[PDB]
Amino acid sequence: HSHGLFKKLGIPGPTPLPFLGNILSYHKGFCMFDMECHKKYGKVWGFYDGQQPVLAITDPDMIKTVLVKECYSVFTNRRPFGPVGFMKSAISIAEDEEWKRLRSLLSPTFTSGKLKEMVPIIAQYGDVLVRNLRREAETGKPVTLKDVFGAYSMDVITSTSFGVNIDPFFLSITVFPFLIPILEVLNNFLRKSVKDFLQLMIDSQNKALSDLELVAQSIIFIFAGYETTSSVLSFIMYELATHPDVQQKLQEEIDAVLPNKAPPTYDTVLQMEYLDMVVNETLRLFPIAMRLERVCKKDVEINGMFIPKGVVVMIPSYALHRDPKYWTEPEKFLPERFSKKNKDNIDPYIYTPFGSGPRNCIGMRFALMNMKLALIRVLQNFSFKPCKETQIPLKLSLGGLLQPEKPVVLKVESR
Amino acid sequence: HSHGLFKKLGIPGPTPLPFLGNILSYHKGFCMFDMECHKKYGKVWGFYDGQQPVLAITDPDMIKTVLVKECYSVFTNRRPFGPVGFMKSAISIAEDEEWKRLRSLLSPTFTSGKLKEMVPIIAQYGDVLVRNLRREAETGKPVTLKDVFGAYSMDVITSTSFGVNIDPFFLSITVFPFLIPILEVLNNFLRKSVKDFLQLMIDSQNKALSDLELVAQSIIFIFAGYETTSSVLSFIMYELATHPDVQQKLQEEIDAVLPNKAPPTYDTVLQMEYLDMVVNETLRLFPIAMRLERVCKKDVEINGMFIPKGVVVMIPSYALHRDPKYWTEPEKFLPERFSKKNKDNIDPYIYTPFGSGPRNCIGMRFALMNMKLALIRVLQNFSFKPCKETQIPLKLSLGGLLQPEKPVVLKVESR
Numbered sequence: 001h002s003h004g005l006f007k008k009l010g011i012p013g014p015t016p017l018p019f020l021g022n023i024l025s026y027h028k029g030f031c032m033f034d035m036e037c038h039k040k041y042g043k044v045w046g047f048y049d050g051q052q053p054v055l056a057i058t059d060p061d062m063i064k065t066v067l068v069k070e071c072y073s074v075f076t077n078r079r080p081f082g083p084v085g086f087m088k089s090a091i092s093i094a095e096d097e098e099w100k101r102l103r104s105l106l107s108p109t110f111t112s113g114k115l116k117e118m119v120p121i122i123a124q125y126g127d128v129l130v131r132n133l134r135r136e137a138e139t140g141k142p143v144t145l146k147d148v149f150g151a152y153s154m155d156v157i158t159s160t161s162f163g164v165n166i167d168p169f170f171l172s173i174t175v176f177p178f179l180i181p182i183l184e185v186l187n188n189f190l191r192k193s194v195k196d197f198l199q200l201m202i203d204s205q206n207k208a209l210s211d212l213e214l215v216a217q218s219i220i221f222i223f224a225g226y227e228t229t230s231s232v233l234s235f236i237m238y239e240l241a242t243h244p245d246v247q248q249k250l251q252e253e254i255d256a257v258l259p260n261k262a263p264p265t266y267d268t269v270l271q272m273e274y275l276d277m278v279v280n281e282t283l284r285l286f287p288i289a290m291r292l293e294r295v296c297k298k299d300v301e302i303n304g305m306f307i308p309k310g311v312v313v314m315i316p317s318y319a320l321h322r323d324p325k326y327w328t329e330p331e332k333f334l335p336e337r338f339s340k341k342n343k344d345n346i347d348p349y350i351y352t353p354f355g356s357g358p359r360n361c362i363g364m365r366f367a368l369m370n371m372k373l374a375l376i377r378v379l380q381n382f383s384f385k386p387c388k389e390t391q392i393p394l395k396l397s398l399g400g401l402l403q404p405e406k407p408v409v410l411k412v413e414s415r
Numbered sequence: 416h417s418h419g420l421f422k423k424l425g426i427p428g429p430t431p432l433p434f435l436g437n438i439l440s441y442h443k444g445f446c447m448f449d450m451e452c453h454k455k456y457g458k459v460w461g462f463y464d465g466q467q468p469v470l471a472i473t474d475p476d477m478i479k480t481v482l483v484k485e486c487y488s489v490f491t492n493r494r495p496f497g498p499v500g501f502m503k504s505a506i507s508i509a510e511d512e513e514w515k516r517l518r519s520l521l522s523p524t525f526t527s528g529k530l531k532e533m534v535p536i537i538a539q540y541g542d543v544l545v546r547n548l549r550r551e552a553e554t555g556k557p558v559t560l561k562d563v564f565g566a567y568s569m570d571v572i573t574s575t576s577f578g579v580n581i582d583p584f585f586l587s588i589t590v591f592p593f594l595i596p597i598l599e600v601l602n603n604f605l606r607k608s609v610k611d612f613l614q615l616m617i618d619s620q621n622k623a624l625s626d627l628e629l630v631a632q633s634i635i636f637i638f639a640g641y642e643t644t645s646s647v648l649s650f651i652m653y654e655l656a657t658h659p660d661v662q663q664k665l666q667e668e669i670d671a672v673l674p675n676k677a678p679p680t681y682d683t684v685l686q687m688e689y690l691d692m693v694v695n696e697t698l699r700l701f702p703i704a705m706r707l708e709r710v711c712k713k714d715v716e717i718n719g720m721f722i723p724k725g726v727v728v729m730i731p732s733y734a735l736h737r738d739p740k741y742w743t744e745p746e747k748f749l750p751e752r753f754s755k756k757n758k759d760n761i762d763p764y765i766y767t768p769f770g771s772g773p774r775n776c777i778g779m780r781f782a783l784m785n786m787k788l789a790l791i792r793v794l795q796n797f798s799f800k801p802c803k804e805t806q807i808p809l810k811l812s813l814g815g816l817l818q819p820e821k822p823v824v825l826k827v828e829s830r
């Protein structure tokens with residue numbers, strides 16, 4: 001009863017089936033579906049997540065309009081996600097004025113000054129990461145990176161935020177979004193554990209912040225602080241192993257900036273350009289968000305195109321990061337794309353690993369620093385080679401979230 | 416999990432039961448529940464329609480703030496009603512900017528000029544109403560008013576709007592509002608019959624109006640144009656029968672303005688003050704809307720009182736129309752309250768039979784004229800006396816909508 005929206009507007013796209021819409025095309029993942037649609041319809045197309053119309057845009061100006069120019073006015077909130085419960089007060093989930101309050105309350109936590117305070121604290125768990133790698137390296141045995149990276153990722157998020165130091169169904173959500181309010185009325189490790197980030201959240205309480213709403217942000221920061229950091233670091237070391245010349249050229253820069261295995265400081269990390277080039281190129285190949293979404297809260301006509309209320313505007317970050325119309329040989333791992341000689345030829349609204357506009361990743365600078373502090377301390381001590389069980393080429397998880405199919409396993413040799 | 420909102424805010428009210436909230440108190444109707452709550456907690460109280468918090472206000476300034484001062488900004492929409500289907504595009508149901516468009520598109524239909532055009536058309540069915548009453552009067556037999564009034568009400572709405580001339584479950588809606596989106600995906604006499612009001616709706620099409628959205632307004636105008644007119648006219652004739660002095664004093668004014676049973680014109684109706692006093696007093700005793708509601712779309716602090724987002728602000732029109740703190744002997748039918756000697760002592764935010772602010776009854780002036788044109792032609796020919804089966808005193812429908820329990824039946828005598 002709503003599958004004729006894009007047909008009325010003259011917007012191309014795949015023909016939706018009743019109830020299901022176009023979800024059956026997700027059998028190859030969100031990424032392959034966006035790449036195929038981008039090659040079939042061009043700059044703009046639409047589809048249906050069940051009965052929910054989703055409009056996809058690939059025009060950099062139109063992307064700037066949604067993410068930056070018309071953020072506070074029209075494209076303020078993402079697709080409604082539930083059931084969440086008390087997590088509705090989370091900044092990544094809150095909407096409209098409730099989000100505007102949380103954004104300002106939590107913004108001063110990721111400043112250039114607050115990050116510099118965490119470098120002396122993070123430098124501890126970097127050495128634990130090396131010494132935990134030193135054990136599984138002297139013993140000739142392939143290492144699951146996401147395990148030793150996830151242990152480092154959780155050790156950082158619990159101390160930077162609080163100070164603690166320690167060593168299948170969403171498919172029906174899109175088909176049955178009417179069942180989301182159902183589960184809300186159908187209804188703890190942290191609801192009392194909360195009873196630094198945690199400091200400022202009470203120091204931005206001295207229009208203040210609640211407590212159940214303080215826990216919700218802490219849980220959110222623990223999610224993204226754990227899974228995103230470990231998953232990207234795994235993606236990086238796979239590329240460094242499958243491209244040994246890049247791994248060595250990176251090791252040469254680390255030793256030049258940090259001789260005698262110097263401790264990586266805040267200022268020494270921002271000086272390494274080839275390290276940032278490797279991180280940015282890996283994030284181009286593997287944008288863990290895959291997609292950026294905004295809900296059209298009222299009828300608009302952006303860049304000469306009518307968009308009706310309720311439509312979910314989507315930006316296919318993965319499909320744009322691998323578009324041959326912007327990247328030469330887009331499947332190859334080439335960090336020289338982000339060299340200061342070639343960095344100018346990159347549209348910031350085509351390359352969006354952290355989003356754009358007022359609602360981008362608030363912890364972008366923290367995530368870049370955390371991963372760079374991890375790579376520096378690890379590559380200072382070890383080199384990485386592919387193993388017999390190393391999945392080459394690496395398959396992406398055909399499911400929902402952006403992960404490798406088989407875990408990344410490489411050989412570790414101590415320098 | 417949300418029954419502590421008014422307890423946190425220090426707002427009094429009845430203690431809600433889990434899931435049900437306070438709906439069990441509706442066993443005496445919305446009206447008796449509001450009257451008892453108004454006497455128990457005073458100016459402001461709160462309750463829960465299941466899990467939905469509803470705040471009741473009785474302060475005229477605070478009522479003016481919600482209905483008039485902060486309408487476009489905060490209190491723009493009513494309680495979400497569903498499942499409606501295509502009727503979501505109806506002006507009484509539409510929200511935010513969609514309603515603002517429909518209001519302006521349909522406003523010029525109820526001007527003082529458009530009503531004057533319908534007086535020569537309505538005057539036809541007034542004589543049919545008399546001649547249909549003349550048959551059941553020469554035959555000594557009590558008449559069900561709502562039947563002969565409903566036949567007149569439908570004959571007017573179909574010709575004024577188009578030109579055609581022809582002679583149990585909502586309880587679960589409040590407990591299970593999560594089931595409303597369910598029924599929406601679960602899914603005609605007028606969807607093709609539409610294929611004057613109907614004129615202007617296409618003449619306000621020559622940012623225009625749709626067609627399925629044109630039918631939705633036509634159906635809405637047929638609802639209120641049928642049930643409201645007949646129900647109030649029944650309430651009026653009961654009061655005129657149970658107060659024969661008022662019925663005669665009204666008959667004297669009608670014959671003075673319209674001698675020799677003159678045809679009631681637009682200008683002759685607005686001259687009769689005692690007729691308007693009878694209509695206004697009946698609407699005080701019987702405000703068919705009972706309640707006025709606005710959804711708080713964002714946190715506000717109106718008249719020194721914090722109100723959170725999502726709360727349904729409610730104005731108990733019935734309870735305020737019978738408040739002894741504003742009306743002396745509020746249960747008695749006394750049209751002299753609206754005399755030009757005493758009309759000044761009436762707060763327009765306490766007496767709201769048609770609402771107030773930008774979202775009041777758009778067909779207020781049409782309804783007043785339609786009923787007055789009906790009373791004039793009927794009282795010119797007949798007098799009304801109570802019968803053996805006349806329910807004296809009249810009981811109100813203890814259920815949902817404001818109706819009499821037993822239908823109003825009176826004796827009719829031709830003058």
Ligand code: HEM
Pocket residue numbers: 067091092093103220221224225228229232283288289292293352353354355356357358359360361362363364366367368
């Ligand atoms: C490699 C690491 C990360 C990447 C690539 C990444 C990427 C993203 C992207 C693409 C968005 C959406 C931007 C948009 O919608 O325009 C986002 C949102 C967000 N990210 Fe991250 N993220 C990373 C790590 C983190 C970390 C460590 C945190 C720590 C708190 C974090 C917190 C958030 C929050 C709170 C939001 C929602 C902000 C809002 O809705 O206002 N992310 N991230």
Ligand code: HEM
Pocket residue numbers: 482506507508518635636639640643644647698703704707708767768769770771772773774775776777778779781782783
């Ligand atoms: C005795 C007769 C009537 C009474 C007492 C009455 C009363 C009311 C009241 C109290 C409201 C809500 C006002 C508010 O929320 O502030 C309303 C709304 C409305 N009424 Fe009536 N009404 C009557 C007859 C009619 C008629 C004949 C029409 C013909 C079209 C009509 C059309 C509407 C509409 C469309 C709305 C919603 C307006 C909007 O939401 O913008 N009503 N009425």
Ligand SMILES: CC(C)(C)OC(=O)N[C@H](CS[C@@H](Cc1ccccc1)C(=O)NCCCc1cccnc1)Cc1ccccc1
Pocket residue numbers: 078079081087092093220223224228288289293361
């Ligand atoms: C992706 C899309 C649009 C198709 O549907 C959605 O699932 N919507 C996302 C909401 S799920 C929720 C995760 C969660 C909450 C409670 C318990 C378990 C799990 C969340 O709010 N997590 C935000 C974490 C911050 C983050 C994550 C990744 C990278 N950097 C930062 C909203 C969303 C989507 C994409 C990026 C960010 C946020």
Ligand SMILES: CC(C)(C)OC(=O)N[C@H](CS[C@@H](Cc1ccccc1)C(=O)NCCCc1cccnc1)Cc1ccccc1
Pocket residue numbers: 493494496502507508635638639643703704708776
């Ligand atoms: C009352 C409350 C707040 C507790 O819940 C609601 O049921 N909400 C009302 C929505 S029901 C709908 C009626 C209908 C639609 C399709 C098919 C069958 C029935 C409607 O939109 N009818 C508006 C008709 C205009 C009118 C009616 C009466 C007097 N004058 C004008 C919204 C509402 C409430 C009170 C007054 C006006 C509108």
